[PDB]
């Protein structure tokens, strides 16, 4: 036959110029049939619709080729609650649209795609159809219809093979519970292979650490009941024999690194056998490989388990992964915060050594850093030479941030007004976005903020904001306190030594205070600043210019966040006040969580919440009355009304107070009090000091995942606060508060649960403040307020 | 200079060479730069302006103002040969 | 007379399938924010008790309803509704 | 709208988006050479005058008559 | 209720409409040890020795009764004997195979062992490895037992003195499906999961033939339905049953090659009466075409997702009551109810009996109340 | 993706894309968009889909259709292995790569972003390279002639920016590799010049001052 006609047919939508590109042999080649087949099937590769007819006649290549509905105009319809977009962009993976001809096996391969989604979930009762009535002159319409049933509600998990080790305690070990009655709520139901696998896991690897080395893995499996679901788990394994981690033993490849290792591979020999102790060792002398620099290392460690004398000697033999390599870092995004802000966030960096150590480090600090939902951190190769691998990393933004308006309750004051916006994201360029308007009637307050921690240098931190806040809110004449506070003040943080940091706080803040209370406490800071108070009205004003610096510094030694098991949050901060402050005065205030279960079982756990604050007034010119740390109220010490231990609330008599507010305002108002009322509750004394015990164990009626989010808190812990600058000749009829024993008896229980959506402390406490200063109330309650 | 007393700069410095004796002992003159490129894994530093002459060095001290210099400059022309071995590991 | 029968062994590497994909999706949740400690001293309440509702993605909108009781100033019913997008 | 915000003739960036700094030859001297040409390098060699920013349009490029 | 009465997936289901009590059943036995069980899955058939209602609960309690009012003679919470804490929780999987002066009975446990008929207290004790899921089959002192994860024992009524263990053939994910290890002729012949049936010998377990016959899930993943569950019926030494989705063979013990076959209807319970055999299907309606080529003259439809046990064609009275404690007697032909009990939410997971024509129930509650219509 | 209702009766592809051509004049390129694209799936025939789809194109990138812009791309170049378009195309499929630009907001001051996405750069950069080669003759022809040069320019100062970055970080040790890349990449850049230099300070304080030297007197006597 000799090809003499380029003879395609159909001509619906095609490129007829790629379609004699389809054709290898072109017209006017003289081929035999084997070159005609070979054409078919090359036509065949177009692989979007090919209705072969291959004529052979005379010369002309009658081959034809019909379209149909082959166009994939598709709909689609009749859908449950699965996600949809899901199944969308899915189509899209495929391309499967308007277009992309058709292909019997491609909508076959989506359909059951989907199924078996369906199946890995277990939702899983397929009625699954992807109907193609195709509009006319070869139109499509598609509706994908599907009715399914929920996932695996978790029936019976029965365990096999179990012995010396009770079910429910593996049970506990793993994830799958299937359990609501009244003792709990939350239980839900659902699949995954992958429980199974970790379980399994959990399992066997807990039986090295009972150090029953051998183990024999049974073919553990699930039956599903029919007709509707049930999910049966047998658990089918095998302990195997119990063993002692007798030696371990090192023969890798290495240079001098096997010295430079045996210090950790060194224990004492003859433990109980230990798989952790195998996980341990291994990730140890990986990270000290990196602590040398290479590639990744094999790591056998093979190990020697006699039976009757329980032996695991460890045949640990690795050798390194191969030599140091260079690598290509490239992020894309590159948005208002440019590349070199997380070129900074990630600890990695070419030209050095590598390591998936360190750009692991990258990786979680990104994730915790954040201004994006993935860090998707894809090693590449580059080829040649084995080194400057690509490693392109991607992230998707968590922009434009905080829209708000909290709107609340007029009525007794103005329906109260909050514009939040916090566009970080956006102008987190490097920067911080916070801005605050809220006003309710009379509590006007302003945060603008902006804050690059890493002004010039990653270690330069810059906040600068004002925070401005109007308290205007009064009941009475002549006696109207309002508190008008601008601040402004730029912050810069230095930790080079981590979880190590000094931070300089440099803020000014005016304060124009009008109409102060007869407070014999404002006013011996009036007379102290020279003020000689009206002693018949509650009506002097200062206006309060000070110009100060602090240094507020941190260190943090802490294992674990949700769970806090061993916490070293060690945080002093001092107020200084130079001459241009209107007062010259110091604030100390210690702050110190020290945290440590003796018990690795968690159930002998010694914790220490320690607070002190001083404050250092330069005389006339003192610590600001109110420059006070809150004594009681629920800070530390529960049940009470903060800032009120110590000092009582004494007014120096004022019945000229103008307006008496109907007692909506007392001790020395005009209907008020007489010579001076020694009224309760006055603003914590100049030092204070507070101590807190804290312990933990689980109650033999609960559940281990319960302990992991319970916390049980045992305390009676009393602190003391008095005003060291004191006097006793007005203070003799009422009492003196020089006095380290301010104390209390709050013999107290308090419980914090931490549901995977919100923590909650509740406590009694059986109180005897020995110095009053507060009121008595047994029932502490709030629920933990995540920030 | 002073004593350990003034402005603060000690977060992690990082600079990576794992340099050994080995690096000591598998060179000779005209070596193969192929076979000293894989011995070497990365040829960090060529002369742009002239023969590969590789390039390597070892500048690291976390932290602290100090830091090594422990510089591989080896000789390559062309015909592959090191005429020479370079290094001032001292600052 | 030829002799050309197998006289070869060949090899060759390929893939044959890859196909994998997996699902995800989230419908809400909520941030409630609670506290009360009671007086217990003359008897009453008082708290700051409020919520959030944690939607998708998007959507986020708070609660809260507080209180202050006993004082000659009392705050009786302070309901407070807010909202959050940072979408 | 009433105010900005708009994009119809002004070519995206501006003119000196179009062209803002022309290259310049730098020259190795002797016995050192430097291999450029290396990725992304197809001689831009143009005639001209060809249309160029406002001048460039991208009209829908039809036929004479349909 | 409205709120948690919308949010969720649903199918179908039937009235069963017209009901004909033209027969008056009356439970002249009514009695009940409760539990039983409530929900779950497995074969827990009580026994009984001339008269003696073996009562029993989902605990390794061992009880009796009498036909009678219902009147126990022994119960022993034989549960466990020295497990980890004093009679542990011990559920049942395996009814009770009551051989001579010993009650039979295994546990998911693994846990095999013969019972004082008199007491229920242990006549010999062989505890076994593998979910013990299938009843003691005490046949002529070959105690065969199969456990659920495709292992099956041969013991002996002694003192269960294992004989011959079969770790046979299952699907890769185990699930659903019981076959009946009956022999005759002396062959260990038993149907089997994955459209598979196997012949092996009663005393090695060796196989004489084996039978590979229809599909289900995996590379054709049918999804939740009730297809054919794998326990047959066989007279002649030839094996009835369909083949896993509903294709009815014949099988000769000495062959089990496939004879005529029927590709019709995913049942899972059926009973033979005389070459007659009868549908049940995915949505447990009834068009009871027997095997004589065609014969659906005792196809009654009237039940959509309704549940059943395996039929009793007792009294000529074509009788079984459902899975959701409903009782029904049916017309001898198709169909209509010669009678019907829509009285119990019961709900049941093993097998009752109609022996001596008096309907010995095992329901989840009202465990056991024979009816006499 | 399927969307644009056809809340319009269904009439010839004819006047529904003459009604197309008046809002391509009109410039209301979504509704232009929505009947083309009405048309094709009333009309998934017609050689007249040809010139719909060009139109789709323009009121595409007229409207800033990105995805859709793509759709049209791969599509049509599925059915052009050559068109009287292509370089049209071709640019277009350039200015494609620019679609991904607009970022904030300037009247008087202005912000940076010559230091971000360079993927589509070089894309744009092989379209254009082509163009020019295959299609030497049009007002897209020059235009890219020049295009190639700006956007090549404007890589060199995003590699300005990368480097400096490692610099300034102390990281030099990167950056000595990198200016012999930029230099596989251009020398004649003037962001090249401007960054030498940068590396010859670094060659001092790594004590390449022997080149540093080298590099400094370049930029003199090369360079400005």
């Excluded at chain 1, 020999?269 to 490989?289: A, H, R």
């Excluded at chain 1, 319960?706 to 004191?726: E, H, K, L, P, Q």
Aim: glycine fraction near 8%; aromatic fraction near 10%; charged fraction near 20%.
């Amino acid at each position: 036959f000799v090809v003499k006609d380029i003879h395609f047919e159909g001509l619906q939508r095609v490129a007829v110029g790629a379609a004699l590109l389809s054709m290898p042999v072109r017209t006017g080649d003289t081929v035999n049939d084997e070159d005609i087949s070979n054409t078919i099937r090359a036509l065949f590769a177009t692989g979007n619709f090919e209705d072969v007819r291959v004529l052979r006649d005379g010369d002309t290549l009658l081959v034809q080729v019909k379209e149909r509905p082959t166009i994939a105009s598709i709909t689609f319809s009749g859908n449950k609650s699965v996600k949809d977009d899901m199944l969308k962009q899915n189509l899209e993976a495929s391309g499967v649209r308007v277009g992309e001809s058709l292909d019997r096996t491609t909508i076959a391969d989506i359909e059951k795609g989907l199924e078996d989604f369906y199946y890995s979930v277990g939702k899983y009762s397929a009625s699954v159809k992807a109907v193609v009535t195709p509009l006319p002159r070869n139109r499509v319409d598609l509706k994908l219809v599907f009715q399914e049933g929920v996932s695996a509600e978790i029936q019976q998990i029965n365990i096999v093979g179990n012995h010396a080790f009770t079910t429910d305690e593996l049970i506990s070990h793993f994830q799958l519970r299937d359990e609501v009655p009244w003792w709990n709520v939350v239980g839900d139901r659902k699949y995954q292979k992958q429980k199974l696998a970790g379980d399994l896991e959990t399992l066997r690897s807990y039986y090295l650490d009972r150090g029953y080395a051998r183990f024999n893995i049974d073919s553990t499996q699930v039956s599903l009941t029919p007709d509707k679901k049930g999910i049966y788990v047998t658990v089918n394994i095998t302990e195997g024999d119990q063993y002692k981690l007798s030696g371990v033993e090192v023969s890798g490849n290495l240079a001098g690194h096997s010295a430079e290792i045996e210090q950790l591979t060194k224990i004492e020999p003859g433990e109980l056998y230990n798989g952790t102790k195998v996980t341990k060792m291994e990730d140890d002398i990986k990270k000290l490989l990196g602590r040398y620099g290479y590639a990744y290392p094999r790591v056998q460690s093979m190990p020697e388990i006699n039976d009757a004398d329980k032996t695991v000697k460890l045949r640990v033999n690795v050798d390194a992964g191969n030599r140091f390599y260079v690598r290509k870092i490239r992020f894309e995004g590159n948005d208002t915060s440019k590349d070199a802000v997380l070129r900074r966030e990630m600890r990695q960096m070419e030209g050095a050594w590598l390591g998936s150590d360190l750009v692991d480090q990258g990786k979680e600090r990104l994730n915790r850093l954040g201004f994006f939902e993935t860090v998707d951190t894809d090693t590449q190769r580059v080829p040649g030479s084995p080194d400057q691998v690509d490693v392109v990393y991607k992230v998707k933004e968590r922009n434009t941030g905080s829209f708000n308006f909290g709107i609340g309750y007029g009525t007794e004051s103005g329906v109260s007004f909050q514009a939040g916006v916090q566009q970080d994201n956006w102008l987190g360029t490097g920067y911080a976005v916070g801005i605050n308007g809220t006003k309710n009637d009379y509590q006007t307050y302003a945060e603008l903020s902006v804050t690059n921690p890493y002004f010039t240098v990653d270690g330069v931190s810059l906040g600068g904001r004002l925070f401005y806040n109007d308290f205007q809110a009064d009941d009475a004449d002549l006696s109207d306190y309002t508190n008008k506070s601008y601040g402004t003040d730029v912050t810069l943080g230095f930790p080079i030594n981590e979880y190590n940091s000094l931070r300089a706080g440099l803020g000014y803040v005016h304060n124009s205070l009008s109409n102060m209370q007869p407070q014999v406490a404002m006013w011996r800071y009036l007379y102290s600043m020279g003020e000689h108070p009206s002693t018949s009205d509650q009506d002097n004003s200062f206006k309060t210019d000070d110009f100060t610096f602090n240094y507020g510094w941190t260190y943090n030694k802490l294992d674990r966040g949700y769970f806090p098991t061993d916490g070293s949050r060690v945080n002093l901060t001092g107020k200084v006040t130079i001459p241009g402050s209107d007062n010259e005065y110091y604030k100390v205030t210690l702050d110190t969580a020290t945290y440590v279960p003796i018990d690795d079982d968690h159930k002998w756990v010694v914790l220490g919440r320690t607070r002190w604050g001083y404050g250092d007034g330069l005389g006339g010119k003192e610590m600001p009355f109110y420059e006070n740390f809150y004594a009681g109220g629920s800070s530390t010490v529960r049940g009470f009304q903060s800032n009120t231990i110590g000092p009582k609330a004494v007014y120096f008599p004022h019945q000229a107070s103008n307006y008496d507010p109907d007692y909506d305002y007392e001790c020395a108002t005009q209907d008020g009090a007489k010579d001076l009322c020694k009224s309760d509750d006055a603003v914590g004394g100049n030092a204070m000091a507070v101590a807190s015990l804290e312990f933990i164990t689980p109650t033999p009626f609960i559940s281990d995942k319960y302990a992991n989010s319970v916390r049980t808190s045992f305390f009676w812990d009393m602190g003391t606060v008095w005003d060291t600058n004191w006097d006793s000749s007005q203070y003799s009829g009422y009492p003196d508060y020089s006095d380290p024993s301010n104390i209390r008896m709050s013999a107290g229980i308090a419980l914090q649960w931490m549901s995977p959506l919100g923590p909650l402390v509740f406590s009694y406490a059986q109180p005897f403040k020995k110095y009053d200063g507060d009121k008595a109330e047994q029932f502490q309650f709030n629920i933990g307020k995540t920030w | 200079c002073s004593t350990l007393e003034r402005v603060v700069y000690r977060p992690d410095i990082n600079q990576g060479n794992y340099l050994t004796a080995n690096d000591v002992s598998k060179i000779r003159v005209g070596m193969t730069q192929q076979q000293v490129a894989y011995a070497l894994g990365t040829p960090l530093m060529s002369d742009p302006f002239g023969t590969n002459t590789w390039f390597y060095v070892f500048r690291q001290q976390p932290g602290h103002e100090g830091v090594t210099q422990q510089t591989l400059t080896l000789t390559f022309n062309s015909s592959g040969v090191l005429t020479n071995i370079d290094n001032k590991p001292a600052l | 007379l030829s002799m050309k029968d197998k006289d070869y062994n060949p090899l060759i590497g390929r893939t044959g399938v890859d196909v994998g994909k997996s699902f995800s999706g989230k419908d809400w949740k909520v941030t409630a924010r609670a506290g009360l400690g009671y007086q217990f001293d003359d008897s009453r309440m008082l708290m700051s008790v409020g919520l959030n509702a944690e939607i998708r993605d998007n959507v986020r909108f708070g609660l809260e309803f507080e209180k202050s009781a006993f004082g000659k100033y009392n705050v009786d019913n302070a309901v407070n509704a807010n909202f959050r997008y940072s979408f | 709208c009433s105010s900005d915000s708009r994009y119809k003739r002004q070519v995206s960036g501006d003119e000196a988006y179009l062209e803002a700094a022309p290259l310049a030859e730098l020259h190795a001297p002797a016995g050192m050479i430097l291999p450029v040409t290396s990725g992304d390098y197809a001689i831009p060699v143009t005639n001209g005058s060809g249309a160029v920013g406002k001048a460039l349009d991208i009209r829908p490029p039809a036929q004479p008559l349909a | 209720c409205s709120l948690f009465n919308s949010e969720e997936d649903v199918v179908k289901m039937s009235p069963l409409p017209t009901v004909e009590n033209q027969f008056t059943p009356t439970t002249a036995w009514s009695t009940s040890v409760g539990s039983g069980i409530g929900n779950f899955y497995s074969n827990l058939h009580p026994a009984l020795a001339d008269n003696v209602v073996y009562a029993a609960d989902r605990a390794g309690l061992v009880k009796a009764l009498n036909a009678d009012d219902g009147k126990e003679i022994w119960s022993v919470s034989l549960a466990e004997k020295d497990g980890w804490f004093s009679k542990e929780p011990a559920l049942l999987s395996g009814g009770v195979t009551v051989s001579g002066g010993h009650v039979y009975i295994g546990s998911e446990k693994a846990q095999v062992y013969a019972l004082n008929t008199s007491d229920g207290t242990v006549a010999w004790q062989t505890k076994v490895a593998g979910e013990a899921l299938s009843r003691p089959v005490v046949s002529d002192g070959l105690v065969l037992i199969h456990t659920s994860n495709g292992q099956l024992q041969a013991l002996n009524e002694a003192d269960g003195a294992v004989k011959w263990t079969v770790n046979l053939d299952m699907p890769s994910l185990s699930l659903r499906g019981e076959s009946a290890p009956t022999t005759a002729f002396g062959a260990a012949v038993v149907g089997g999961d994955n459209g598979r049936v196997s012949a092996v010998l009663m005393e090695q377990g060796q196989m004489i033939w084996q039978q590979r016959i229809s599909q289900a899930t995996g590379s054709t993943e049918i999804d939740r339905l009730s297809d054919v569950d794998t326990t047959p019926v066989v007279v002649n030494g030839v094996v009835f049953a369909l083949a896993y989705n509903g294709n009815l063979t014949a099988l000769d013990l000495r062959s089990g090659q496939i004879m005529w076959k029927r590709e019709l209807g995913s049942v899972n319970d059926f009973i033979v009466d005389g070459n007659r055999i009868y549908l049940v299907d995915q949505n447990d309606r009834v068009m009871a075409l027997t095997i004589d080529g065609g014969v659906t003259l005792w196809t009654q439809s009237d039940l959509l997702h309704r549940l059943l046990t395996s039929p009793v064609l007792y009294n000529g009275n074509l009788v079984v009551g459902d899975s959701e404690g409903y009782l029904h007697w049916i017309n001898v032909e198709d169909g209509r109810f010669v009678a019907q009990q829509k009285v119990d939410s019961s709900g049941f997971q093993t097998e009752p009996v109609a022996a001596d024509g008096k309907l010995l129930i095992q329901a989840k509650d009202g465990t056991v109340y024979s009816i006499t219509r | 993706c399927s969307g644009s209702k056809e809340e319009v009766p269904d009439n010839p592809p004819n006047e529904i894309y003459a009604t197309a051509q008046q809002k391509l004049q009109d410039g209301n390129w979504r509704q232009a968009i929505t009947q083309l694209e009405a048309l094709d799936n009333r009309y998934p025939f017609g050689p007249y889909s040809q010139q719909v789809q060009l139109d789709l194109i323009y009121a595409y990138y007229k409207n800033a259709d990105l995805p859709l812009a793509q759709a049209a791309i791969d599509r049509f170049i599925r059915l052009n292995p050559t068109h009287p378009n292509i370089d049209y195309v071709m640019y277009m499929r350039g200015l494609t790569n620019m679609a991904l630009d607009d970022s904030a907001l300037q009247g008087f001051f202005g912000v940076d972003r010559s230091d971000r996405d360079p993927q589509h750069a070089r894309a744009a950069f092989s379209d254009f390279s082509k163009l020019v080669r295959g299609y030497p003759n049009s007002q897209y022809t020059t235009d890219a002639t020049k295009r190639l040069v700006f956007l090549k320019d404007r890589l060199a100062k995003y590699e300005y920016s990368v480097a400096e970055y490692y610099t300034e970080r102390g990281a030099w040790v990167a950056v000595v590799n990198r200016v012999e890349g930029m230099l596989r990449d251009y020398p004649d850049t003037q962001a090249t010049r401007d960054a030498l230099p940068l590396m010859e300070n670094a060659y001092r304080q790594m004590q390449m001052n022997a080149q540093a030297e080298k590099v400094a007197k370049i930029i003199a006597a090369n360079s400005s």
